[PDB]
């Protein structure tokens, strides 16, 4: 999971600025997502749809388009990128953007932040606040985020 934490923060904190919230609360979100990168959407050729945050690809995407199964078993559109950085941006947009996100921005505490998007129908699982809040104040999270940094202070 760390490399996972070390590639998305920078693009978590470029989005996060733009969205007025937090970087690791971005961060959490992916990993929560994606099982801290271990279960990502791929595209059939191998290489990953790049989608941390499982974004549906619905009428008004006309980009690239991967296809998985959900849970009997749908076969759901998903969005597909070049990059977690071009992930990242789409991500920016729709929730920098949309009005049903517009209590996002300025949330600095991670229930408020998850329930945030619940309102906006980012997922529907009334446990999804508690779920994400639950990484998002993690010691596991803690712990990655202080071994991404390239400082550290010492105890005295």
Known sequence: AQAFVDATWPQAAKAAQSLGVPAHFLV???ALETGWGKS?????????????????AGSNWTGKVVEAR?????VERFRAYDSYEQAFQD???????????????????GH??????????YAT???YADKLAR????????QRLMASAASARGLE
Request: glycine share 10%; aromatic share 8%.
């Open 125 to 127: 699982d009334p446990s």
């Open 28 to 30: 959490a979100q992916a």
């Open 112 to 121: 408020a932040f998850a329930r945030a998007l619940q309102e906006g129908g």
């Open 70 to 74: 959900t849970v009997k078993v749908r």
């Open 40 to 56: 990502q959407i791929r595209n059939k050729d191998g290489t990953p749809s790049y989608n941390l945050f499982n974004i549906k």
């Open 135 to 142: 990484v998002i104040n993690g010691n596991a999270l803690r």
């Open 91 to 109: 991500y920016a947009d729709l929730v920098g953007n949309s009005p049903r996100y517009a209590k996002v921005a300025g949330k600095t505490d």
